[PDB]
Chains A and B, each alone.
Chain A
Amino acid sequence: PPNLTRRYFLYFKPLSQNCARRYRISSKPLSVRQIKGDFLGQLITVRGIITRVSDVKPAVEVIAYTCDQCGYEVFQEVNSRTFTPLSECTSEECSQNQTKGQLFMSTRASKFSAFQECKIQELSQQVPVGHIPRSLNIHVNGTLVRSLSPGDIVDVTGIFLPAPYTGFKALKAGLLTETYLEAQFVRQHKKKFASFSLTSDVEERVMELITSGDVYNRLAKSIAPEIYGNLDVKKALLLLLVGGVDKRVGDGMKIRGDINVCLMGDPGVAKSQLLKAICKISPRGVYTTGKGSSGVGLTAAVMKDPVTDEMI
């Protein structure tokens, strides 16, 4: 088949509706809960949050089977999770042959492409009243596997698709389906620090920003204006975000350009608006309570992975 002559994957991305409204839609940011069944495989954009994705790993799309005797190749095709190999020689020269010399396979001629899974979880403000939200799975392949990391706003795009499960063989009525979705593109409203590069407009943004002046105290003014005053502490948070400067000893040590801050004080005065604005704006952000699951939930877990036997 022509699939092993392909030196190119494809990964779509849908429109942003800003252009669909130009000249006049189809796929809005949707829920884990608002599938409505009929949206299997239709074109879609889901938001939410990624809890846990496994590591990228390889998976066949096309076999390379060669003959010992005929010296010719065979192309065994799989799209399932599984297959059964091809051992006896059904070759084309062995067809016109008494003896049927055994064939075997390759480790390089045989096509490959990776396969990685990810779990969305639902956004809070769109859960209806009193309702415990629910989960979902996606499958990805190949190139875009590296554009996903847990803890972020996301707008996955693609298509929601089925697969073979029926429950577990007693609580059944037939035709039942476990399911998944296709990954083709990632946008996220949170731009991590390592995606930065200047251009002919964002440099203009920084320009017109710096042009006004008073830039330092202006920043520490714009930090969470919902709450009153104490510019000295808004400034200290700004500096916590900066972190500092990394320096290396070059003798087997470095030292952090990193900050650590505290705001002791009595109640009544505002305390928490700060932290919530912080984790609102800063990426790679985190809130915790004080007590509850502090035993290990601030710490490293141990878990087996669904899609592959491994101790992650």
Chain B
Amino acid sequence: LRIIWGTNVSIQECTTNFRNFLMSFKYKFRKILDERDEELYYIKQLNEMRELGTSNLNLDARNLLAYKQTEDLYHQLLNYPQEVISIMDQTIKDCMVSLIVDNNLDYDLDEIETKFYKVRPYNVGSCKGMRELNPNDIDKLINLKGLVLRSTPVIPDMKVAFFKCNVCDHTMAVEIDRGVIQEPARCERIDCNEPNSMSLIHNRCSFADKQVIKLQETPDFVPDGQTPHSISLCVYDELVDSCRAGDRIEVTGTFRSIPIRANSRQRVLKSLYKTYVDVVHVKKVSDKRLDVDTSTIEQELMQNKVDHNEVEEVRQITDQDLAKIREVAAREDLYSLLARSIAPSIYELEDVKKGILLQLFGGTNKTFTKGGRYRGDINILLCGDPSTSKSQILQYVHKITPRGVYTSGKGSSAVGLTAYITRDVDTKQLVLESGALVLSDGGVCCIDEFDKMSDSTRSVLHEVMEQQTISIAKAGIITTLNARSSILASANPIGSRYNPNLPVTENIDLPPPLLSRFDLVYLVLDKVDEKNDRELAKHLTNLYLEDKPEHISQDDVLPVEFLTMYISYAKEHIHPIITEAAKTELVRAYVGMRKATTRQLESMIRLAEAHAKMKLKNVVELEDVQEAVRLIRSAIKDYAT
């Protein structure tokens, strides 16, 4: 028997069971979890990784839940994660060199013995936010889901306590002991004995890296009377410059406690321990929504490369699904099936939904040698009767888009949109907070009730609709930043119940230029008649007929996943350069439609090039201009007046 004090954790038995589970795991969870070819799920990781020289690895919880001999390991890595991982980092090197025994190799063995190893349990048992952590369950592997507000700078920490003796041309050295230093006062008695003569230098010593992150908590359930909390934590080195503002996150870590000082003056402390979280792994992406522009973030990619930390930045693909995509694109009912699939719970709204999807393609992101940039974003407006799915559409897009914020009515101001400055409650120092405009930099910026908004708040969007650049000049802060988000929002009519026979470029309670510069608008008038109403009636009732609408899957609808991944590969790998035929159909379209300004030109091109991105063309074509100008005149309903 071997065992730890206050503990039921064996080292070598854990190593053996680890190794046996490791040699034995072959998509077991497909079998035991569910009904769902391959072989030895895990082992391929450990065969591949060696030649690339990396000291990391990821790991599920379920594969322990699936394999026989790992059910007790689950509750033990759970309770003693840093201890169980101080084991497994050794068991892993053990399994490594127990697996190399069956191989003869060029002399790479100068390194692996000098190497370290570490693990990252990510997809784990769910936890309900923060309130659950009454003190019974502190210091345990934990999972969470939320987004980012504020990032600190780097905390260093003594990691090698260098020490300069004053005499005898001698240095000295000593390391950290559960997080302290006990300076050796003496002077190395043999050579010289001066029992408190020694000095300290920083430039010698070894420093750690630590960072702290403010986070907003976004549960799935809340109690009666709930509201946000803002939590701090600690990440450590090799994870730096990963998670920042503008990201939703699923995460893991360990909940813990700590006291603080009463002052900078003495050691008298608080009865109540400030809580926090130490970090184990972060999940930057997920399945139910697409990901960042791959062009936007290049410097961060090459940085993570240089740093040899490779926690994900972009979802990865399979070739069989690439072929699946080239198959699904061969058919011609794309242009409608995308539409029918965006919103099965809703009636037709064809052009509306198509425009939503074309903005989700976005468009073109070109730059100039030094003095140009033209971004893939087309600002969108809606208008018409209430009592439709305008608001529903908008909630839907705000969910499904990764990087975006929602605004409503007149409860907003320029201060809470561009930069604002504030103070921390712990450090009591002057630290900033990013603005809801810039948070969506790349993605969605959603609004409702655009009309009643203050003219102070409505004044800023003059420039954001052009350059994706806000500027600030206020206290101790001067910097023109970038806000590549797109705009997508509702308007409400002049008065109530409409005025069919009037220039609707005047019938809004909104002036011309603000409205003309929108790349496109959509219209929601009623036109009451059956053949559009009864059908919608059953369309929305049969939703309620079921506990949840799965039998809405009829009438040819896709799933979200193949869709979204097709979209992501599309967004990330094609560049349609503009063609010559489309010129002569675009120019005449614009000019003849002028009978109301030059921005709808930019609208047509930025949307037709997205039409080109769709179908997976690496080229635009004359035909895209056709549906472009067509659906434009269908949008504002050219025929009536």
Which residues of chain A have a CB within 8 Å of any CB of chain B?
A: 55-60, 78, 80-85, 102, 104, 107-109, 112-115, 145-146, 149-151, 192-194, 245, 247-253, 255, 284, 299-300, 304, 307-311
Contacts and interface: CB of A to CB of B under 8 A. Distances in A.
Contact of A107 (B130, B257, B266, B392): B257
A104 B176 CA distance: 13
Contacts of B544: 245, 247
A247 B270 contact: no
Contacts of B275: 57-58
Interface string B204-233: 000000000000000000011101011000
Contacts of A299: 411
B556 interface: no
B138 A58 contact: yes
Nearest to B393: A253
B224 A114 contact: no
A311 B230 contact: yes
B560 interface: yes
Interface in B382-399: 392, 395-396, 399
6 closest A-B pairs by CB: A59-B272, A58-B135, A250-B548, A112-B135, A252-B399, A309-B425
A307 B270 CA distance: 11
Contacts of A300: 227
A59 B399 contact: no
A250 B272 contact: no
Interface of B: 6, 130-131, 134-135, 138-139, 178, 180, 182, 223-225, 227, 229-230, 256-257, 259, 262, 266-275, 288, 343-345, 392, 395-396, 399-400, 411, 425-426, 543-544, 547-550, 560
Nearest to A192: B224
B392 A253 contact: yes
Given A250-B548, A253-B399, A310 B425 contact: yes
Contacts of B425: 304, 309-311
A115 B273 CA distance: 10
A188 B463 CA distance: 55
Contact of B135 (A84, A114, A308): A114
A58 B257 contact: yes
Contacts of A193: 224
B346 to A, nearest CB: 10
B270 A82 contact: yes
Contacts of B223: 149
Contacts of B257: 58, 107, 112
Contact of B225 (A58, A151, A304): A151
Contacts of B399: 252-253
B549 A249 contact: yes
20 contacts: A55-B130, A60-B271, A82-B262, A83-B268, A84-B266, A107-B138, A107-B257, A108-B138, A109-B6, A113-B135, A194-B224, A248-B548, A250-B549, A250-B550, A251-B549, A251-B560, A252-B288, A252-B396, A308-B272, A311-B425
B386 to A, nearest CB: 13
Given A252-B400, A253-B392, A304-B425, A58 B345 contact: no
A60 B273 contact: yes
Contacts of B411: 299
B268 A58 contact: no
Contacts of B345: 249, 251, 253
Contact of B139 (A102, A108, A149, A151): A108
B551 to A, nearest CB: 11
Contacts, number: 111
A84 B547 CA distance: 60
B224 A284 contact: yes
Contacts of A252: 288, 396, 399-400, 560
Contacts of A115: 271-272
Given A253-B395, A284-B224, A247 B134 contact: no
Interface of A is mostly: loop
Contacts of A85: 267, 269
Contact of A112 (B230, B262, B273): B273
A58 B225 CA distance: 22
A309 B130 CA distance: 18
Given A149-B224, A151-B225, A253-B345, A56 B272 contact: no
B219 to A, nearest CB: 14
Contact of B273 (A59, A108, A249, A307): A59
A108 B257 CA distance: 10
B262 to A, nearest CB: 7
A150 B225 contact: yes
A78 B270 CA distance: 10
Contact of B178 (A104, A109, A151, A251): A104
Nearest to B395: A253
B465 to A, nearest CB: 28
B426 A309 contact: yes
A122 B170 CA distance: 72
B475 to A, nearest CB: 19
A56 B271 contact: no
A249 B551 CA distance: 11
Nearest to A104: B178
B272 to A, nearest CB: 4
Nearest to A255: B392
A261 B130 CA distance: 36
A102 B179 CA distance: 13
Given A82-B269, A149-B224, A252-B396, 8 more contacts: A57-B272, A59-B271, A60-B259, A145-B134, A251-B343, A253-B345, A253-B395, A309-B426
B270 A107 contact: no
B179 to A, nearest CB: 9
Given A56-B131, A102-B182, A108-B139, A81 B273 contact: no
B508 to A, nearest CB: 26
Pick from A80, A81, A307 the residue with the most CB of B within 10 Å.
A81
A146 B560 CA distance: 39
Nearest to A68: B177
A310 B6 CA distance: 35
A30 B208 CA distance: 57
Nearest to B259: A60
A151 to B, nearest CB: 7
Contacts of B230: 310-311
A109 to B, nearest CB: 7
Contacts of A104: 178, 180
A58 B256 CA distance: 10
Contacts of B395: 253
A109 B272 CA distance: 16
Pick from A58, A194, A245, A309 the residue with the most CB of B within 10 Å.
A58
A78 B269 CA distance: 11
Contacts of A114: 134-135
